[PDB]
Design an enzyme around this catalytic site. Structure first.
Site, PDB file in Angstrom:
ATOM      1  N   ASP A   1       0.840  -1.200   0.000  1.00 38.14           N
ATOM      2  CA  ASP A   1       0.000   0.000   0.000  1.00 38.14           C
ATOM      3  C   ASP A   1       0.889   1.269   0.000  1.00 38.14           C
ATOM      4  O   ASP A   1       1.791   1.453   0.856  1.00 38.14           O
ATOM      5  CB  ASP A   1      -0.929  -0.022   1.269  1.00 38.14           C
ATOM      6  CG  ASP A   1      -1.780   1.233   1.401  1.00 38.14           C
ATOM      7  OD1 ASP A   1      -2.471   1.578   0.421  1.00 38.14           O
ATOM      8  OD2 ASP A   1      -1.764   1.896   2.473  1.00 38.14           O
TER       9      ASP A   1
ATOM     10  N   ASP B   1       1.015   5.123   0.478  1.00 38.64           N
ATOM     11  CA  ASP B   1       0.335   6.269   1.027  1.00 38.64           C
ATOM     12  C   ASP B   1       1.167   7.546   0.837  1.00 38.64           C
ATOM     13  O   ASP B   1       1.725   8.088   1.825  1.00 38.64           O
ATOM     14  CB  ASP B   1       0.094   5.981   2.489  1.00 38.64           C
ATOM     15  CG  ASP B   1      -1.027   5.000   2.687  1.00 38.64           C
ATOM     16  OD1 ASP B   1      -1.474   4.381   1.665  1.00 38.64           O
ATOM     17  OD2 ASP B   1      -1.452   4.788   3.854  1.00 38.64           O
TER      18      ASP B   1
ATOM     19  N   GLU C   1       1.323  11.263   0.609  1.00 43.66           N
ATOM     20  CA  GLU C   1       0.487  12.406   0.969  1.00 43.66           C
ATOM     21  C   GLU C   1       1.299  13.662   0.716  1.00 43.66           C
ATOM     22  O   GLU C   1       1.964  14.111   1.633  1.00 43.66           O
ATOM     23  CB  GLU C   1       0.053  12.349   2.462  1.00 43.66           C
ATOM     24  CG  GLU C   1      -0.983  11.245   2.719  1.00 43.66           C
ATOM     25  CD  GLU C   1      -1.410  11.092   4.170  1.00 43.66           C
ATOM     26  OE1 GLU C   1      -1.616  12.109   4.870  1.00 43.66           O
ATOM     27  OE2 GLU C   1      -1.565   9.933   4.597  1.00 43.66           O
TER      28      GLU C   1
ATOM     29  N   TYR D   1     -11.913  11.610   5.318  1.00 44.48           N
ATOM     30  CA  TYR D   1     -11.798  12.096   6.703  1.00 44.48           C
ATOM     31  C   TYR D   1     -10.716  13.202   6.724  1.00 44.48           C
ATOM     32  O   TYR D   1     -10.102  13.478   5.672  1.00 44.48           O
ATOM     33  CB  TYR D   1     -11.513  10.945   7.713  1.00 44.48           C
ATOM     34  CG  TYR D   1     -10.472   9.951   7.237  1.00 44.48           C
ATOM     35  CD1 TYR D   1      -9.130  10.307   7.146  1.00 44.48           C
ATOM     36  CD2 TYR D   1     -10.827   8.633   6.941  1.00 44.48           C
ATOM     37  CE1 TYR D   1      -8.151   9.369   6.710  1.00 44.48           C
ATOM     38  CE2 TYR D   1      -9.865   7.713   6.496  1.00 44.48           C
ATOM     39  CZ  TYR D   1      -8.558   8.110   6.387  1.00 44.48           C
ATOM     40  OH  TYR D   1      -7.672   7.205   5.989  1.00 44.48           O
TER      41      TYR D   1
END
Ligand SMILES: COc1ccc2c(c[n+](C)c3c4cc5c(cc4ccc23)OCO5)c1OC
Ligand SMILES: COc1ccc2c(c[n+](C)c3c4cc5c(cc4ccc23)OCO5)c1OC
Length: 570
Positions: free
Chosen positions: A290, A292, A294, A370
Site C-alpha cells: 500500500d 500512502d 500524501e 476524513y
C-alpha cells in the site's frame, strides 16, 4: 555399535533455527540488523559420553537424511543448511564399521517469515465487537499502527480479525530526505536516521525494530530463544489463524511522505521498487504493498515540496512499475499480491493525478474521506461527512459561490461524496473504491455560543485553538481524540452527552458532533448513525467496501456499524 548421540539442547540454541537472522539486542542500520538466507544455518551439538563415538554421523528430519559428517571425539558439532521452514522430528545417528545407533527424536524449529513454524494466534478481542455474516467479497479494512503497542497498549491479538478482510500496517518509512519527520519532535527522526545508516536513499526500512520484531509478547508465547518476536511474529501467527486475511505494509503516510517527491527521477523509483521486492521476499506474511503518498502535487506536511505537473505522472509510473515487480513475485511464489493506495480526496488533490490511468494497475484505492476539517485552524466543519453540512454557505458545496471575503470558491467543498464523485467522473471504476470511516474525532476549544451565526449549529462558530486533553481520555495529540474516548467521556452509555457535552447530528451532512457550550470544546467524528449512512452510500454506488483509521481507537462500535451498514442500506 557406537553410543547413540544425546542432543545438547541448550548448547544448540534450544533447537530454534531461522531463515532470517535478526539482531535482538541492539538498534542499528536495517542491513546490519536483518539478513534473510535462502538456506537456514543449522548447528547441533551432541555428546557420546560413554562407550565408543564411532566415525560418522547422519542427521534425519522426519526420517529423511539431511546432513552427514565426521565424528572425531566425545562431543561433535553438526553444522549444515536447510531450506524449508517448519517443525521437524530430528534424529542423529552415529556410525562405525559395525553399524549405527540413532538418538531418540526431538522437535527442531526452523522459523520462516510466513509463520509456517507457528500455531494460530490466540486472540484477546473486546467482546463489544459482534459477529457478522457479511459477504466475504465486500472489503472491510483497517489500519493497525506499529506504535499502538506503547501508551495505547493495543496489540495484534486485540484486533477483531474475523470482522476484517485487510489489515494495513502503518507505517514503513523510506530512507532519504525526511525533514517532515523531524518536525514531529520526539524520537521518530532519530529512530529513522539510525535505521537508515548503511542503507541507500529511497530504500524502505523498518522504523521501530523493537515493536516490529524484538519485543517479547507473553500472550504469543515468545521466549528468549524465539527467533522472531514483536508485532511481525504475531502477524505471522495471525496468518495461520486467518489464511484469507490480507496483511499489507503501508509505505509513507502524512509525515513519512517526503522521499516520494523525488520519484520524478526514475533511478529513485527503481531503487525503491527493488527494495520493496526484497522486503516482501524477507517478510513473507505480507500480501502486497500500500502506497500512502500524501500527496502528489503537494499540500501535505512538506511545505516546500510538491510538483503538480510531474508528481501525477510519477505516481502512475510508480504504480505500473510496482505491478510489474509484483507480477514477478506472483510468478516466483504462486501467490496473489495486491497493490493499493490511500489518497487525498479534496478536489485540489484529485486534480493532480489521472486516477483512471493509475487504477488500472491497482486492486483498490482507499479514499481518505476524513480529515476534511481539523484543529490546524480555527474553522469548524465536519471532518468526515458524506454530504455538505447545513453550516456551508450558498454555492460552497459545488464551489460555484463566494466566501466571507467575497472570494470565489476555488473548488467543490471537502465531503466524502464530492471526493467519490470526482474519482468516478475521471473514470475510476466504483468497484475499486473503498470508502473511509474515522475511528477518532478532531476538535477545537473556544467555540462558545457567542461565536455562532446559527445558534443551533456549532459548525457556524469560530475556535480559539485545537482541542486539549489527556491520554487518559484518548487524546494522544492536540486536536485529536480516540472514538473510544469520545464514547467514554463525552457521549456516555445512552449517547445523549456527559461531563457538560451535548450530542448533535447534522442530518443533511450525515455527521455527528459533541459540543461543550461552556469550554467551547467541539469534536467532529463518525458514529453508529453516520457509519450506517456510509454503508448505504457504498452499497448504492457499488463501491468495493469500507475501511477505517485506526483500529486501536475503536471500542467495537465503529467496526460493528460498518458491518451493520453494509447489510442494510438497500
Ligand atoms: C496552506 O498551505 C499549507 C501549509 C502547511 C501545511 C499544509 C498542509 N499540511 C497537511 C500540513 C501538515 C500536514 C501534516 C503534518 C504537518 C503539517 C504541517 C503543515 C502543513 O503532520 C501530519 O500531516 C498546507 O496545505 C497546502
Ligand atoms: C498554511 O496554513 C496551514 C497550516 C497548517 C496546516 C494547514 C492545513 N492542513 C490540512 C494541516 C494539517 C492537515 C492534516 C494533518 C495535520 C495538519 C497540520 C497542519 C496543517 O493531519 C492530516 O491532515 C494549513 O493550511 C490551512
Amino acid at each position: 555399535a557406537p553410543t547413540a548421540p544425546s542432543i545438547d539442547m541448550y548448547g544448540s540454541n534450544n533447537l530454534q533455527f531461522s531463515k532470517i537472522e535478526l539482531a535482538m539486542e541492539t538498534t542499528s542500520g536495517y542491513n546490519d540488523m536483518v539478513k534473510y538466507h535462502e538456506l537456514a544455518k543449522i548447528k547441533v551439538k551432541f555428546n557420546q559420553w560413554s562407550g565408543t563415538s564411532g566415525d560418522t554421523y547422519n542427521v534425519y528430519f522426519d526420517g529423511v537424511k539431511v546432513a552427514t559428517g565426521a565424528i572425531t571425539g566425545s562431543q561433535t558439532t553438526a553444522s549444515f543448511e536447510y531450506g524449508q521452514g517448519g517443525l521437524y522430528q530430528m534424529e542423529i545417528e552415529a556410525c562405525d564399521a559395525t553399524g549405527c545407533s540413532k538418538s531418540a527424536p526431538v522437535e527442531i524449529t526452523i522459523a520462516d517469515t510466513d509463520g509456517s513454524h507457528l500455531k494460530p494466534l490466540t486472540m484477546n478481542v473486546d467482546p463489544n465487537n459482534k459477529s457478522y455474516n457479511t459477504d466475504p467479497s465486500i472489503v472491510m479494512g483497517t489500519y493497525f499502527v506499529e506504535w499502538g503497542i506503547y501508551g495505547r497498549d493495543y496489540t495484534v491479538d486485540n484486533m477483531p480479525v474475523d470482522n476484517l478482510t485487510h489489515i494495513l500496517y502503518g507505517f514503513i518509512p523510506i530512507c532519504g530526505p525526511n525533514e517532515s519527520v523531524k518536525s514531529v519532535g520526539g524520537n521518530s527522526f532519530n529512530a529513522l536516521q539510525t535505521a537508515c545508516r548503511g542503507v541507500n536513499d529511497y530504500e524502505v526500512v523498518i522504523h521501530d525494530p523493537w515493536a516490529a520484531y524484538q519485543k517479547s509478547f507473553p500472550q504469543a508465547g515468545h521466549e528468549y530463544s524465539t527467533p522472531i518476536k514483536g508485532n511481525y511474529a504475531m502477524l505471522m501467527a495471525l496468518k495461520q489463524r486467518n489464511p484469507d486475511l490480507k496483511i499489507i505494509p503501508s509505505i509513507g503516510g502524512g509525515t513519512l511522505s517526503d522521499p516520494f517527491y523525488d520519484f520524478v527521477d526514475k533511478k529513485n523509483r527503481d531503487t525503491f521498487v527493488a527494495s520493496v521486492k526484497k522486503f516482501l521476499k524477507t517478510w513473507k506474511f505480507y500480501d502486497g504493498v500500500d502506497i500512502d503518498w500524501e500527496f502528489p502535487g503537494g499540500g501535505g506536511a512538506a511545505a516546500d515540496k510538491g510538483d503538480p505537473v510531474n508528481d501525477g505522472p510519477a505516481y502512475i509510473a510508480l504504480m505500473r512499475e510496482l505491478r510489474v515487480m509484483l507480477d514477478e513475485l506472483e510468478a516466483e511464489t504462486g501467490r496473489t499480491y495486491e497493490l493499493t493506495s490511500a489518497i487525498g480526496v479534496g478536489y485540489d488533490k484529485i486534480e493532480d493525478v489521472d486516477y483512471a490511468d493509475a487504477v488500472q494497475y491497482m486492486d483498490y484505492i482507499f479514499a481518505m474521506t476524513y480529515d476534511f476539517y481539523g484543529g490546524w485552524n480555527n474553522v469548524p466543519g465536519h471532518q468526515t461527512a458524506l454530504y455538505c453540512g447545513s453550516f456551508m454557505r450558498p454555492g460552497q458545496c459545488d464551489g460555484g459561490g463566494v466566501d466571507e471575503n467575497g472570494e470565489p470558491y476555488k473548488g467543490p467543498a471537502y465531503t466524502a461524496d464530492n471526493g467519490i464523485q470526482l474519482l468516478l467522473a475521471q473514470g475510476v471504476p466504483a468497484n475499486k473504491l473503498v470508502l473511509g470511516t474515522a475511528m477518532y474525532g478532531r476538535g477545537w476549544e473556544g467555540v462558545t455560543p457567542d461565536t455562532l451565526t446559527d445558534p443551533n449549529d456549532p459548525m457556524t462558530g469560530t475556535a480559539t485553538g485545537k482541542l486539549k486533553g489527556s491520554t487518559a481520555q484518548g487524546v494522544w495529540e492536540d486536536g485529536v481524540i480516540d472514538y473510544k474516548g469520545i464514547k467514554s467521556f463525552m457521549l456516555g452509555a445512552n449517547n445523549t452527552g456527559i461531563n457538560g457535552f451535548e450530542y448533535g447530528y447534522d442530518a443533511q451532512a450525515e455527521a455527528p458532533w459533541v459540543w461543550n457550550r461552556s469550554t467551547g470544546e467541539l469534536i467532529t467524528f463518525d458514529d453508529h448513525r453516520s457509519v450506517l449512512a456510509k454503508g448505504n452510500y457504498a452499497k448504492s454506488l457499488g463501491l468495493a467496501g469500507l475501511f477505517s483509521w485506526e483500529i486501536d481507537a475503536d471500542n467495537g462500535d465503529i467496526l460493528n456499524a460498518m458491518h451493520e451498514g453494509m447489510a442494510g442500506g438497500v
